[PDB]
């Protein structure tokens, strides 16, 4: 053969899956909370972000199985759940920085171990997460400048929508 992956690479893929499953759930819960609170526009964005992380998790599961490893979907990473709009954005941002650090370490490990296709998967995920970090930092900058109440209003729909 053989497609049998390096144990350490499969470990890194399973670490990424743990983080991705955490993000799926954190974003889904934040979507539902934001909706209940009346911030329907931000809630919609949060739901879309959860679905994007579902696609990441699927890519990771697929790669693990190709490498003849066993994907772990039994546990999810610790959730950070906000209690207002600013805390939701901050919680998501911290989660994104954690994933960024993980994928940077993982791409280096894959490179060193000669799994260039897995390295490329971590490079794709890294670019995606930096995109999300940039989005969140922008929202938090906007919220700081126009104030939390105006940011909340901006991200809520009128009663007839």
* Binding site as annotated, residues for Mg(2+): 36, 52-53, 56, 108, 111, 132
| Surface-to-core class of residue 118, CB atoms within 10 Å of its CB (0-12 exposed, 13-18 middle, 19+ buried) | buried
Residues in CB range of 47: below 8 A, 6 or more apart: 27, 28, 31
| Residues annotated within a binding site for Fe(2+) | 20, 48-49, 52-53, 56, 96, 129, 132
Among 10, 23, 33, 57, which residue interacts with ligand HEM (rule: CB under 6 A)?
Answer: 57
The count of chain residues that interact with ligand HEM, using the rule CB under 6 A, is 10
Structure token digits, residue 85: 């709009």
Q: Which is nearer to ligand HEM, 26 or 118 (CB)?
A: 26
User: Which of 16, 19, 21, 143 forms a contact with ligand HEM (CB under 6 A)?
Assistant: 21
Binding positions for its own copies, 79-118, rule CB under 8 A: 79, 84, 97, 104, 107-108, 114, 116-117
Task: Tell me phi and psi for residue 67, to 5 degrees.
Answer: -80, 5
Q: Which residue has the tokens 């772990």?
A: 72
């Amino acid at each position: 053969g053989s497609m049998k992956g390096e144990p350490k690479v499969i470990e890194r893929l399973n670490e990424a899956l743990f983080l991705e499953l955490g993000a799926v759930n954190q974003y889904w819960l934040h979507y539902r909370l934001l909706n209940d609170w009346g911030y329907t526009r931000l809630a919609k964005k949060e739901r879309e972000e959860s679905i994007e992380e579902m696609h990441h998790a699927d890519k990771l599961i697929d790669r693990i199985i190709f490498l003849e490893g066993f994907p772990n979907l039994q546990t999810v990473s610790p959730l950070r759940i906000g209690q207002n709009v600013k805390e939701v954005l901050e919680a998501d941002l911290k989660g994104e920085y954690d994933a960024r650090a993980s994928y940077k370490e993982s791409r280096e490990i894959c490179d060193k171990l000669g799994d260039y296709v897995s390295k490329q998967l971590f490079d794709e995920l890294l670019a995606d997460e930096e995109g999300h970090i940039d989005f969140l930092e922008t929202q938090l900058d906007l919220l700081a400048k126009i104030g939390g109440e105006r940011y909340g209003q901006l991200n809520a729909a009128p009663a007839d929508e």
